[PDB]
Design a protein around this motif. Structure first.
Motif, short mmCIF file in Angstrom:
data_model
loop_
_atom_site.label_atom_id
_atom_site.label_comp_id
_atom_site.label_asym_id
_atom_site.label_seq_id
_atom_site.Cartn_x
_atom_site.Cartn_y
_atom_site.Cartn_z
N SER A 15 0.85 -1.18 0.00
CA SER A 15 0.00 0.00 0.00
C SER A 15 0.88 1.23 0.00
CB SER A 15 -0.92 0.01 1.21
OG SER A 15 -2.28 0.14 0.82
N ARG A 16 2.06 1.12 0.61
CA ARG A 16 3.00 2.22 0.60
C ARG A 16 3.59 2.34 -0.78
NH1 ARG A 16 0.83 1.72 4.46
NH2 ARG A 16 0.82 -0.41 3.60
N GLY A 17 3.70 1.22 -1.48
CA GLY A 17 4.18 1.26 -2.85
C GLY A 17 3.18 1.98 -3.73
N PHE A 18 1.90 1.73 -3.51
CA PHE A 18 0.86 2.39 -4.29
C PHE A 18 0.85 3.87 -3.99
CE2 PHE A 18 -3.86 2.47 -5.59
CZ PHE A 18 -3.50 2.73 -6.89
N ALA A 19 1.06 4.22 -2.73
CA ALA A 19 1.11 5.62 -2.35
C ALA A 19 2.26 6.30 -3.06
CB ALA A 19 1.26 5.77 -0.85
N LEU A 20 3.44 5.70 -2.98
CA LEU A 20 4.61 6.27 -3.63
C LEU A 20 4.37 6.43 -5.12
CD1 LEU A 20 7.84 6.85 -3.58
CD2 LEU A 20 6.50 6.85 -1.47
N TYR A 21 3.82 5.40 -5.75
CA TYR A 21 3.54 5.45 -7.18
C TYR A 21 2.62 6.60 -7.50
CZ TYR A 21 4.82 2.36 -11.00
OH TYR A 21 5.44 1.78 -12.08
N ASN A 22 1.46 6.65 -6.85
CA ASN A 22 0.49 7.69 -7.14
C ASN A 22 1.08 9.07 -6.96
OD1 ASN A 22 -1.59 6.08 -7.96
ND2 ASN A 22 -2.75 6.21 -6.04
N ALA A 23 1.86 9.26 -5.90
CA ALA A 23 2.50 10.55 -5.66
C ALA A 23 3.38 10.93 -6.83
CB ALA A 23 3.31 10.51 -4.38
N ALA A 24 4.26 10.03 -7.24
CA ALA A 24 5.15 10.31 -8.36
C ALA A 24 4.40 10.62 -9.64
CB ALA A 24 6.10 9.15 -8.58
N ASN A 25 3.36 9.84 -9.93
CA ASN A 25 2.57 10.07 -11.13
C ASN A 25 1.90 11.43 -11.07
OD1 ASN A 25 3.24 7.43 -11.82
ND2 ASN A 25 1.34 6.60 -10.96
N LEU A 26 1.32 11.76 -9.93
CA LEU A 26 0.66 13.05 -9.77
C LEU A 26 1.65 14.19 -9.94
CD1 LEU A 26 -1.49 14.91 -7.41
CD2 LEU A 26 0.62 14.20 -6.26
N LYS A 27 2.86 14.03 -9.40
CA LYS A 27 3.87 15.06 -9.54
C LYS A 27 4.17 15.31 -11.00
CE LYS A 27 5.91 13.66 -5.31
NZ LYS A 27 6.25 12.21 -5.23
N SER A 28 4.37 14.24 -11.76
CA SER A 28 4.67 14.38 -13.18
C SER A 28 3.50 14.98 -13.94
CB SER A 28 5.06 13.03 -13.78
OG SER A 28 3.97 12.45 -14.48
N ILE A 29 2.29 14.60 -13.58
CA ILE A 29 1.11 15.14 -14.25
C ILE A 29 1.01 16.63 -13.99
CG2 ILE A 29 -1.22 15.50 -13.39
CD1 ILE A 29 -1.95 14.10 -15.57
N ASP A 30 1.29 17.04 -12.76
CA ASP A 30 1.23 18.45 -12.43
C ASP A 30 2.35 19.21 -13.10
OD1 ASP A 30 -1.07 18.38 -10.86
OD2 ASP A 30 0.07 17.80 -9.07
N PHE A 31 3.48 18.56 -13.31
CA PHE A 31 4.58 19.20 -14.02
C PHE A 31 4.13 19.50 -15.43
CE2 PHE A 31 8.14 18.32 -16.99
CZ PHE A 31 8.85 19.49 -16.78
N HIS A 32 3.51 18.53 -16.09
CA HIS A 32 3.03 18.74 -17.44
C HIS A 32 1.96 19.80 -17.47
CE1 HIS A 32 4.18 14.25 -17.72
NE2 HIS A 32 5.20 14.98 -18.13
N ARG A 33 1.09 19.81 -16.47
CA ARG A 33 0.06 20.83 -16.40
C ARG A 33 0.68 22.21 -16.30
NH1 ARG A 33 -4.73 16.97 -14.94
NH2 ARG A 33 -5.57 17.67 -16.95
N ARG A 34 1.72 22.35 -15.48
CA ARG A 34 2.42 23.63 -15.37
C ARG A 34 3.00 24.05 -16.71
NH1 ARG A 34 6.16 21.34 -11.39
NH2 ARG A 34 4.62 20.00 -10.35
N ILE A 35 3.63 23.11 -17.41
CA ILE A 35 4.20 23.41 -18.72
C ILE A 35 3.12 23.93 -19.65
CG2 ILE A 35 5.29 22.39 -20.76
CD1 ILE A 35 7.17 22.84 -18.46
N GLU A 36 1.98 23.25 -19.69
CA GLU A 36 0.90 23.66 -20.57
C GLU A 36 0.33 25.01 -20.17
OE1 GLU A 36 0.15 19.47 -20.77
OE2 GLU A 36 1.91 20.35 -21.76
#
Length: 61
Positions: free
Chosen positions: A13-34
């Motif tokens: 479950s901590r792995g899922f948390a870590l994954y989701n966090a990283a994915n969200l970070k990258s998604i927000d990075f792309h959102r900032r770029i856009e």
């Protein structure tokens, strides 16, 4: 190894948390770029318009 793999599932479950966090970070990075890109487009669009208005008033003069 029983211990290792028993607790791999315990920390999955901590792995899922870590994954989701990283994915969200990258998604927000792309959102900032856009967001920046859309703002750049607006800045440029305004320059184009402002000129076509300094030249429009220039025609009037």
């Amino acid at each position: 190894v029983r211990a290792d793999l028993q607790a791999t599932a315990l920390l999955a479950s901590r792995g899922f948390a870590l994954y989701n966090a990283a994915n969200l970070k990258s998604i927000d990075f792309h959102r900032r770029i856009e967001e920046k890109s859309l703002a750049q487009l607006k800045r440029q669009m305004e320059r184009i318009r402002a000129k076509q208005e300094k030249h429009r008033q220039g025609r009037v003069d």
